From a paper:
[name] hemagglutinin (HA) is a pH-sensitive metastable class I viral fusion protein that undergoes dramatic conformational changes between pre- and postfusion states. When it egresses from the cell, influenza HA0 is cleaved into the head domain (HA1) and the membrane anchored fusion domain (HA2) to become a fusion competent HA1/2 heterotrimer. HA2 consists of the N-terminal refolding region 1 (RR1) that contains the fusion peptide (FP) and a heptad repeat (HR) motif (residues HA2 1 to 75, using the [name] numbering), the central helix (CH, residues HA2 76 to 105), and the C-terminal refolding region 2 (RR2, residues HA2 106 to 184). In contrast to influenza A, an additional challenge for [name] HA is that the correct native conformation relies on HA1/HA2 processing, which allows for native folding of the stem without splaying at the membrane-proximal base.
Numbering used by the authors:
A (entry chain C), B (entry chain A), C (entry chain E): 1 to 163, 163A, 164 to 344
D (entry chain D), E (entry chain B), F (entry chain F): 1 to 166
The structure:
Amino acid sequence: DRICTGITSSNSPHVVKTATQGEVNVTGVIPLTTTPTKSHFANLKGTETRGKLCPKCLNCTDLDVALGRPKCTGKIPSARVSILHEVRPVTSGCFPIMHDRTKIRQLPNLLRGYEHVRLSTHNVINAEGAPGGPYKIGTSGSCPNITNGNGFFATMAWAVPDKNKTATNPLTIEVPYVCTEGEDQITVWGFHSDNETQMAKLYGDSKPQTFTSSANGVTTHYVSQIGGFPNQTEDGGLPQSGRIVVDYMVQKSGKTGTITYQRGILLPQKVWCASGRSKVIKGSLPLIGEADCLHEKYGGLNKSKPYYTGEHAKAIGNCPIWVKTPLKLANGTKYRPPAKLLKER
Amino acid sequence: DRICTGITSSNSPHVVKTATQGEVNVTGVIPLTTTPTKSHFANLKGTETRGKLCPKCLNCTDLDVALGRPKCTGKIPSARVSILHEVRPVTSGCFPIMHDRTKIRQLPNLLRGYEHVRLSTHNVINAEGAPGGPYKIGTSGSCPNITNGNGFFATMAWAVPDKNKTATNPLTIEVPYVCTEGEDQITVWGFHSDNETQMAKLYGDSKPQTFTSSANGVTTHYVSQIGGFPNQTEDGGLPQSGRIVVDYMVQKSGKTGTITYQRGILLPQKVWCASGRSKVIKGSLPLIGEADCLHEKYGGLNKSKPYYTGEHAKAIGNCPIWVKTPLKLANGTKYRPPAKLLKER
Amino acid sequence: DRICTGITSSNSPHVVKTATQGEVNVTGVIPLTTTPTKSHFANLKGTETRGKLCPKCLNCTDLDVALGRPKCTGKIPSARVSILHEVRPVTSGCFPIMHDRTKIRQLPNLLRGYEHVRLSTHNVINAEGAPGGPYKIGTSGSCPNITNGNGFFATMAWAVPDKNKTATNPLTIEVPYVCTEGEDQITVWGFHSDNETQMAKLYGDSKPQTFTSSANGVTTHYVSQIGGFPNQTEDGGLPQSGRIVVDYMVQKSGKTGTITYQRGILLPQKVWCASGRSKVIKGSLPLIGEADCLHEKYGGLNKSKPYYTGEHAKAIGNCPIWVKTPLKLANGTKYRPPAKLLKER
Amino acid sequence: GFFGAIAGFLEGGWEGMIAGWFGYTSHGAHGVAVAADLKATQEAINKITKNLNSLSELEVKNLYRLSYAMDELHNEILELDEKVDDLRADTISSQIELAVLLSNEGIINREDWFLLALERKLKKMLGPSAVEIGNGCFETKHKCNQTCLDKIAAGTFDAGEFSLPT
Amino acid sequence: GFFGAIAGFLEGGWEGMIAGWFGYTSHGAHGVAVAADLKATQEAINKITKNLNSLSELEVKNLYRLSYAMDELHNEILELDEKVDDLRADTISSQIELAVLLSNEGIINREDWFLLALERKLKKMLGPSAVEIGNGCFETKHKCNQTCLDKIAAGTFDAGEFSLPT
Amino acid sequence: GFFGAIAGFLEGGWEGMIAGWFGYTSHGAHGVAVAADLKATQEAINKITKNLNSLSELEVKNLYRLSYAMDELHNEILELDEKVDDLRADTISSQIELAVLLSNEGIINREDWFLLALERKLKKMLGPSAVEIGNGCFETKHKCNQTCLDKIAAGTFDAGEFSLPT
Ligand SMILES: *[C@@H]1O[C@H](CO)[C@@H](O[C@@H]2O[C@H](CO)[C@@H](O[C@@H]3O[C@H](CO)[C@@H](O)[C@H](O)[C@@H]3O)[C@H](O)[C@H]2NC(C)=O)[C@H](O)[C@H]1NC(C)=O
Ligand SMILES: *[C@@H]1O[C@H](CO)[C@@H](O[C@@H]2O[C@H](CO)[C@@H](O[C@@H]3O[C@H](CO)[C@@H](O)[C@H](O)[C@@H]3O)[C@H](O)[C@H]2NC(C)=O)[C@H](O)[C@H]1NC(C)=O
Ligand SMILES: *[C@@H]1O[C@H](CO)[C@@H](O[C@@H]2O[C@H](CO)[C@@H](O[C@@H]3O[C@H](CO)[C@@H](O)[C@H](O)[C@@H]3O)[C@H](O)[C@H]2NC(C)=O)[C@H](O)[C@H]1NC(C)=O
Ligand SMILES: *[C@@H]1O[C@H](CO)[C@@H](O[C@@H]2O[C@H](CO)[C@@H](O[C@@H]3O[C@H](CO)[C@@H](O)[C@H](O)[C@@H]3O)[C@H](O)[C@H]2NC(C)=O)[C@H](O)[C@H]1NC(C)=O
Ligand SMILES: *[C@@H]1O[C@H](CO)[C@@H](O[C@@H]2O[C@H](CO)[C@@H](O[C@@H]3O[C@H](CO)[C@@H](O)[C@H](O)[C@@H]3O)[C@H](O)[C@H]2NC(C)=O)[C@H](O)[C@H]1NC(C)=O
Ligand SMILES: *[C@@H]1O[C@H](CO)[C@@H](O[C@@H]2O[C@H](CO)[C@@H](O[C@@H]3O[C@H](CO)[C@@H](O)[C@H](O)[C@@H]3O)[C@H](O)[C@H]2NC(C)=O)[C@H](O)[C@H]1NC(C)=O
Ligand SMILES: *[C@@H]1O[C@H](CO)[C@@H](O[C@@H]2O[C@H](CO)[C@@H](O[C@@H]3O[C@H](CO)[C@@H](O)[C@H](O)[C@@H]3O)[C@H](O)[C@H]2NC(C)=O)[C@H](O)[C@H]1NC(C)=O
Ligand SMILES: *[C@@H]1O[C@H](CO)[C@@H](O[C@@H]2O[C@H](CO)[C@@H](O[C@@H]3O[C@H](CO)[C@@H](O)[C@H](O)[C@@H]3O)[C@H](O)[C@H]2NC(C)=O)[C@H](O)[C@H]1NC(C)=O
Ligand SMILES: *[C@@H]1O[C@H](CO)[C@@H](O[C@@H]2O[C@H](CO)[C@@H](O[C@@H]3O[C@H](CO)[C@@H](O)[C@H](O)[C@@H]3O)[C@H](O)[C@H]2NC(C)=O)[C@H](O)[C@H]1NC(C)=O
Ligand SMILES: *[C@@H]1O[C@H](CO)[C@@H](O[C@@H]2O[C@H](CO)[C@@H](O)[C@H](O)[C@H]2NC(C)=O)[C@H](O)[C@H]1NC(C)=O
Ligand SMILES: *[C@@H]1O[C@H](CO)[C@@H](O[C@@H]2O[C@H](CO)[C@@H](O)[C@H](O)[C@H]2NC(C)=O)[C@H](O)[C@H]1NC(C)=O
Ligand SMILES: *[C@@H]1O[C@H](CO)[C@@H](O[C@@H]2O[C@H](CO)[C@@H](O)[C@H](O)[C@H]2NC(C)=O)[C@H](O)[C@H]1NC(C)=O
Ligand SMILES: *[C@@H]1O[C@H](CO)[C@@H](O)[C@H](O)[C@H]1NC(C)=O
Ligand SMILES: *[C@@H]1O[C@H](CO)[C@@H](O)[C@H](O)[C@H]1NC(C)=O
Ligand SMILES: *[C@@H]1O[C@H](CO)[C@@H](O)[C@H](O)[C@H]1NC(C)=O
Ligand SMILES: *[C@@H]1O[C@H](CO)[C@@H](O)[C@H](O)[C@H]1NC(C)=O
Ligand SMILES: *[C@@H]1O[C@H](CO)[C@@H](O)[C@H](O)[C@H]1NC(C)=O
């Protein structure tokens, strides 16, 4: 007799790629990729995840909370992961704003990149005694407070001259640093303007006014407009005749800021003290359920295979790795012609 | 007798590098690199390639076309690859400009990063009825049109007061969005200034004027100069006594812009509507021939070897890959001492 | 008898990681990593290393030398590696400055990124004949020179009106390019302000003044303050009543700059001509000794092992490579059960 | 592989092997008989499993948004950030494809060493009187039917019962 | 390699081999005779060619200019962009050098497996009566001149014509 | 390895080997005797040393500060620069771990080829009359005590002195 060693022969419908033989047919494989399917966004498994800034504040948007609208004040919980669910945030509240003449729409999104965010407990300057005369603090009917009747944003003070209604030269305030040592300070200020008759009635001058700010080498300059405003959007719905322009400046730890102003200033009162860092990707709300990974194109994912094929995007968590092609690991033997019967002659 | 297996012995002048034996001598090799030679620039093989912006406009530079000079208007063909052949573009045309007080020289290069670029078909604002009084539109003798005699740039309107020659406070226009939804809008504006006598004759005031622009959070401020200008360069050659300062602002889709101005404004008329994306590298003109790859140091290349050694730079197309050293793949057998005669005793 | 081949058996306390067997026990290893220890900073071995800008200038800080303080002038040696030892540089010298209203504190650090830095030999403009009237050049008692008695910074000229003490409109100077062709030009300018009485005595106007600068598309705007200044810090110790605000602008080769000003200008005299490039990391002084590598967390290192584990940071020189885990190379044989006596039965 | 092309191995295989990849076949007067080896198949499977574990246990760092850069105010920085993400994905994908190519290369090459091991296990267990030809086949002096190969592939074959020296 | 250093192979080679890299040589009373094997040489060449194809078929993404960043207004962004290009070129160059080092390592190591394959092909074709020594050489009972080795290396040698058992 | 699991090798080793990793052992009436081979150990050590030199001779580019970006005025650019450094360190670390994994894989696999080399060196030097079993062991017709193995492992054993054909 003749006893020999050999190798099986079977159906070999799979193809793999080697480095010295080219592409070969193999009996079986192990896939290493999937193409996922679009789903909704979830809570990250093991970490606290931020959606809205204050979720216990009802009937508030994120810009409402960032600007300090009355009845939208609350404690902001910490989080190590955030969702950016709104690329151009809106108000629904207080006095009407001309949102598009500054960069204020992006203030909530900035605030969501820090882990700890809080509103100071004291005012940064005393408004009634600031340069430019004794002031009285103005309130608006389109801004009611907890016992209804008149209010304003908690981050600013509308300073109207008390006794002397006259024009002025530019005035300068130095905005101090009131947070603790590792924290950044975000200061919110702005100005108000109206039509000619009301400008002469409130302030004593009916010409455009000039405003300047400076912090950490960054400088900004504005000029106001008298009359002929666009229409009111995203506000309380009462008719008005004037508008406000709002801005913010960042003070890195230890540093002081400067504002130069004329008639119509909204002086800063409460500042945001912010420290730490958070991880942000774009998503949508509500967050339903729990998942291993969050992906910008696919939502929540659970990791099964080590790799994936599809659209590459940003992701946070326990995620697979992106590859160009579907990859396979051989789990068989190379193709073997059914040459039993050839040798069996 | 004795029959043995063996291996040849030959001249082994080549050296390759292994991981467990060091460097060895081998009979033959396969090179994998070349050092290319500097050549001219060509057309990319398989793609439409942009040189000049409007190549059917004769006697025009790129900044002439970008500013809308008369007889330099034409249709701008689309392209997915562009050549940046001029790091500081020049004019040769219309009214003289003080090019170095703004960022306008870079407007053509910006326009060449978009795939589709066109000039709107209607004016963005009505110039004669803008704030600041009824206006009349000024023309220049150094800017003749198709039937010669007087013209101006098509992107701007020189607004001179019609009846009342008086000073003014700052005025504000809101520049609207007139392109379709996926497109960016580039707005071109500026101002004119002269010596004292002519400033009092044209506008009614002989002091410096202040101009401001704002779009998408970006703000800019200018002050004009009365008399004592530098010399005229890159213009039609007629003597003048005043100069213009030109700038542009970008409006991302949906957004509105703002200009604040005084006497001497050149108001925007035609805006650039631009969408898509193009791939840019630095090169030179003319484009002669066709090639697989375009390289910033070597020009047009045809791919022969997978790698190259030389100066690394940016490249577009079907290109080899850069490596530090010349690489070789062994195509022989290791060095074998000619020990025939040693065993042949 | 029976003669067999075999493999030794020993203590196998080391563990290495393979790709098809998992983790195995091995007789011996070769380590490839270390965790270094914090040390002081040294001189790079083979290269000239910069600490202070002028180390032969005694009792000077780096900002003193950058601003041109009297008796702090000297030749600045070239170097291909620099140490950034001060994240907010201080003065100790001349007239008091309000350092925090501009970006001037960072001027020394900018200057330390160039290989060649020198101060021009002629003044860039003639100060007494500049626009705004005939001027006389002011000196300060808190700024004595080599034969004591009165001086000022060598990069600026304090221009006070000679005969006519009146208010003015904005004036414009064009700052020319005086360095050679491959070099960048850094221009230093500023302005002085005081309380109301002294402003009316020195200049003839007691209102805030406006200053603007423009170079290479970058624009900046300032407004001055009358009275109520903060306290003097980092100066010569004499009592004063006014303060200066200082800034710089960069002109890339060939380009011209522009300044617009009013009463109180400190016009530029000597400019910094700078070319080349240097390598910078953060460290501390003094430099003691010599080392192969400089590391931002560990100081000077000598290379023993190819890799290291610890905190990753920037480094310059002949340095090891960072890896996540301690790595080992097997230098033994796999674990072998002491089965002598098992077969020895 | 390149080893069996020269050494003279058989280029085809048997479909009587259903319980394994590698095995034995005996050709004689009665015809052909086939049996499968279980231990060789098992350790080939084990090595492929350890290789899969090695491939599945590598980590790279997450890519998410920059904290300080805002839309429409920092467009240049955000374009460079997108380019950085593109390039990093490209590099890691190329590295993973290289690792899988090396893995499949090794898996396909082991098919001749798994067969040399079988050949000389068979030589040891088949007794001193057998003769090696050179291409994995052996010539015996005794009949070997299906139960014979069943005992051979199971590691219980003893030539003593066949009245031949061992 | 490390295999022939211990197994006792010859450290030198023959220049009578002009038509191949690997081959046979017979030493006897008449002196020496040399012949070359063509199939082994051919498949070694084929494997090196497939390896070259594998090395030549990898792609990386193009590096070109940023669309929105302008000269002298965005110098900081453009310096960072240049640094990104430098680092990416460095990383891909290091990876390519690693792949070529592995390729050359494999090509130089195969020289002893190509020779074991030849040794046992020769043993199979040389007949049952030959004796293996251990270092690739064989002792025969018959004369083998140049035409003998010509028929051996061509795969047509039959010991039956030599009046010896096969 | 996977080769000795099937070929029938011994799963244990000897601690009489103090002067090497690989060696010989003779089992007979007198009991056991052990000796160590020096050349095999030496070239295994040499190959590990060349591998260490290959691992230790790769360079990457330095990472230092950008020359034009200043603190607190260019914070967005500096955050992106820090991210670039993080990503580059991660990529190069992953590549180095892959190279070390391949090195250790090769070092652990060579342990069976170093032993096949020893087996057939022993077969060549032990004389034509010995019989190979199949798992590296050999049967001789003569006594072999410690001095016998001392001469065998030193490469001076000659069977002529043992009154047996060579
Ligand atoms: C090795 O692997 C390849 C890749 O899977 C196998 O090729 C495949 O073979 C089947 C059978 O012929 C092809 O099916 C097709 O059926 C249609 C009718 O539905 C017929 O018109 C086609 O001509 C073809 O027969 C299948 O398309 C084909 N796949 C590819 C990508 O070409 C191959 O059979 C395997 N085995 C061998 C020995 O090559
Ligand atoms: C500038 O804005 C102010 C905003 O108050 C405009 O004043 C308002 O003008 C309307 C015009 O009719 C006044 O309505 C009047 O209300 C009184 C009291 O209810 C009523 O007796 C009249 O018959 C009429 O309905 C309104 O009171 C008045 N508000 C004020 C003065 O506070 C003003 O018209 C605007 N100016 C221009 C030029 O647009
Ligand atoms: C990814 O994996 C997570 C974790 O398993 C999945 O969340 C799981 O979803 C199931 C089904 O909705 C829930 O568990 C079960 O819910 C039923 C609801 O009646 C409850 O009666 C069972 O006792 C059990 O709790 C739950 O939401 C959650 N499981 C756990 C243990 O937390 C998720 O659906 C997976 N997919 C994605 C895309 O995230
Ligand atoms: C292995 O490869 C190396 C690298 O090519 C070979 O080294 C080379 O050998 C030649 C012959 O000696 C050298 O030529 C030179 O000629 C000049 C006269 O023109 C003489 O002065 C030199 O002393 C030398 O002989 C050549 O420079 C040399 N290359 C290098 C880089 O050193 C080597 O011959 C090859 N073979 C062996 C067995 O090493
Ligand atoms: C400010 O710029 C204006 C630019 O027009 C200067 O006005 C021009 O001044 C020249 C000086 O001679 C005038 O030339 C005259 O032309 C008339 C008509 O051809 C001729 O009769 C005279 O003999 C002389 O050649 C020119 O007409 C005049 N252009 C005007 C008024 O439109 C003006 O001088 C500049 N002012 C300063 C202070 O530099
Ligand atoms: C890279 O490869 C391209 C493609 O082959 C080269 O362009 C080729 O250049 C030849 C020679 O100038 C031209 O083809 C021939 O031109 C003659 C001119 O008389 C014509 O009579 C022939 O019939 C033929 O068309 C042509 O420009 C072009 N060939 C093709 C088929 O398009 C190029 O020169 C190579 N090198 C570089 C650096 O690009
Ligand atoms: C293979 O390598 C591993 C890794 O070093 C060895 O494991 C180690 O074995 C020793 C001896 O048992 C362990 O020592 C410990 O001693 C304490 C008392 O101080 C005792 O309570 C522990 O239970 C243990 O015996 C050592 O912790 C252990 N290392 C690890 C990481 O588990 C192993 O011995 C080596 N050899 C074999 C055959 O596995
Ligand atoms: C604005 O700043 C100037 C800075 O000089 C202040 O002027 C200084 O005011 C003090 C106040 O007493 C003067 O001191 C006097 O000195 C003279 C001469 O030594 C002495 O006779 C007096 O008894 C008194 O000590 C000082 O001379 C004066 N310096 C001057 C005028 O150059 C001024 O007070 C400040 N204004 C305000 C409103 O703060
Ligand atoms: C890294 O390596 C350098 C280079 O060796 C080390 O610097 C060496 O430090 C030694 C000890 O301080 C010095 O060399 C000796 O100094 C004594 C001082 O009395 C002198 O008498 C000897 O003749 C000898 O010069 C020297 O500073 C320096 N050696 C040389 C040759 O330059 C350094 O300490 C090592 N470590 C670090 C963290 O840099
Ligand atoms: C809510 O808003 C009302 C607006 O009237 C506030 O009531 C006035 O508050 C001021 C501030 O102390 C008092 O001087 C007035 O006497 C209050 N009554 C009036 C104007 O009728 C009320 O204090 C606010 N409640 C808050 C802020 O908690
Ligand atoms: C070319 O420029 C000439 C400049 O005179 C234009 O001619 C005048 O155009 C205006 C605009 O409608 C008319 O009001 C005048 O009556 C024209 N004739 C004059 C001033 O003599 C001419 O229209 C321009 N051609 C174009 C723009 O196609
Ligand atoms: C050092 O400073 C003193 C300050 O008095 C300078 O002395 C005056 O210099 C000016 C400039 O030429 C002369 O017009 C005066 O006549 C000098 N004497 C006075 C005012 O008493 C001196 O020149 C400076 N030395 C330098 C700059 O080297
Ligand atoms: C939120 O808004 C709804 C809609 O008007 C209202 O009914 C509800 O009372 C509001 N809740 C609070 C807490 O203000
Ligand atoms: C503002 O409101 C009026 C009133 O309906 C409307 O006619 C006008 O179009 C609105 N303006 C804009 C810009 O929509
Ligand atoms: C272009 O300029 C040349 C040079 O003067 C001139 O001869 C030619 O007519 C011009 N062509 C057009 C179309 O303007
Ligand atoms: C301007 O032109 C005049 C006339 O030739 C010349 O003297 C002067 O130098 C020119 N100015 C410059 C800056 O070249
Ligand atoms: C300035 O100096 C005075 C005098 O001691 C001191 O009272 C005051 O607190 C100082 N100002 C600051 C901001 O420290």
